[PDB]
Amino acid sequence: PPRPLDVLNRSLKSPVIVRLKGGREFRGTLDGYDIHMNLVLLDAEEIQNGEVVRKVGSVVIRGDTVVFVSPA
Amino acid sequence: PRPLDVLNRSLKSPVIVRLKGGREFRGTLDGYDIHMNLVLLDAEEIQNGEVVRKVGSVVIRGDTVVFVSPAP
Amino acid sequence: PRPLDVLNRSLKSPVIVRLKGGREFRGTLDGYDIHMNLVLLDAEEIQNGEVVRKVGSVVIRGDTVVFVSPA
Amino acid sequence: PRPLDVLNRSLKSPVIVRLKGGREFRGTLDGYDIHMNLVLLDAEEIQNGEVVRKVGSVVIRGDTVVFVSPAP
Amino acid sequence: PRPLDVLNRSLKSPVIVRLKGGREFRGTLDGYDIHMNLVLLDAEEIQNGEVVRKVGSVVIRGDTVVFVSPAP
Amino acid sequence: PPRPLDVLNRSLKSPVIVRLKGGREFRGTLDGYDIHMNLVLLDAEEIQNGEVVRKVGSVVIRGDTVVFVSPA
Amino acid sequence: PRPLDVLNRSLKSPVIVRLKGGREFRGTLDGYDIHMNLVLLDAEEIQNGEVVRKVGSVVIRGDTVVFVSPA
Secondary structure (H helix, E strand, O other), X not given: OOOOOHHHHOOOOOEXXXXXXXXXXXXXXXXXEOOOOOEEEEEEEEEEOOOEEEEEEEEXXXXXXXXXXXXX | OOHHXXXXXXXXXXXXXEEOOOOEEEEEEEEEOOOOOEEEEEEEEEEOOEEEEXXXXXXXXXXXXXXXXXXX | OOHHHHHHOOOOOEEEEEEXXXXXXXXXXXXXXXXXXEEXXXXXXXXXXXXXXXXXXXXXXXXXXXXXXXO | OOHHHHHHOOOOOEEEEEXXXXXXXXXXXXXXXXXXXXXXXXXXXXXXXXXXXXXXXXXXXXXXXXXEEOOO | OOHHHHHXXXXXXXXXXXXXXXXXXXXXXXXXXOOOOEEEEXXXXXXXXXXXXXXXXXXXXXXXXXXXXXXX | OOOHHHHHHXXXXXXXXXXXXXXXXXXXXXXXXOOOOOEEEEEXXXXXXXXXXXXXXXXXXXHHHEEEEEEO | OXXXXXXXXXXXXXXXXXXXXXXXXXXXXXEEOOOOOEEEEEEEEEOXXXXXXXXXXXXXXXXXXXXXXXX
């Protein structure tokens, strides 16, 4: 069964859209991840209900709030 | 009989994935693990019943899944 | 008697599965695991006491389950 | 004294099991485990007094359980 | 030192148990375990200054508990 | 890397402020804790919506409800 | 460069910490563990864009954190 985590691994260094719980979303470049699916994005923006609320050079996201991750 | 075995015979075949909140995904199943994290290819994100996006790859966190059903 | 054993007794028989939120599934119990994930053949999703979806089969994540009982 | 031991001596006895969302179940306690998943026989599903349905048996997920109490 | 130990100090003495949702249980602490499940005897369920239910004994799932304290 | 739990230890027998899920709060003296952050406070007080609601001699707080702990 | 590696690079540096429920903390990152529990120094609790508390030190349960960002 292909493993879901290997799909993040294949996405390293590329732009991705990350959907979090609560209508929050992140767009940035994936530079790291772990088992719990905690993520690290470089050059990213935080969207809150279709609206940009902040841009940061780096963010560490708790896997607990991740709904899905897909390469852009 | 085991549930994951069902996901197995659904590999490289169309499925419907309902998530918490009402969000839905229709795509080709490419992978899964024991926690039921999933990977879909050529999928359509569907909110409220309308195609809100079209991604060719998505990793979905198990915690968010309510159910997975093969395509009619 | 243990919970998982009462499930086994329900195989090949119709069951009602309530989920968090309030939705339900009516179908034939074809399988399950320790996590309480389940498989239903010829099932219907039910919201407010009315059918909203018919599926040849479904895998339901144990985590979303509230209860399972024979129909 | 152990909470699960109280459950043990209540086997085959009638009990009320309250779930989250104000839902309750009235039946005979037939089984349970560490996580507090329960098995009730000849149980009445109650919602604000009125009976939703009655079942020969029901498997209830520990997660949705608020409490259990006799009801002689 | 350890939280449960201070809970042991209360065996056979009345306590207050605040549940998730805002409800409370007042009763005699007869037992408990590591999951923090509780056993209360001759207890009352409380909702906004009023006793909404009486039970001769009740087993509460640790999961739904916010805190436990001796009588005020 | 300094460890959160050790900083928490340096606060034993000292007044702390504990924020719980849902705006609830506790102000009391830190007496114990475990790895999951289950806590024990002596001479504490509950606070809801900005107002005191009760005073307890001791209270055990479930870790999963805690948001943060800080010296008063 | 997993998650925890990024957090280490931020020790003794100021960070933004978003919590579930709207609350936000801003301060120097003094510590962390695998559970992602955090220790901040000279931090402000922010809610609705207004400082609602100034603390010399705060320990945050990892399960309550949404994300951590170097500021």
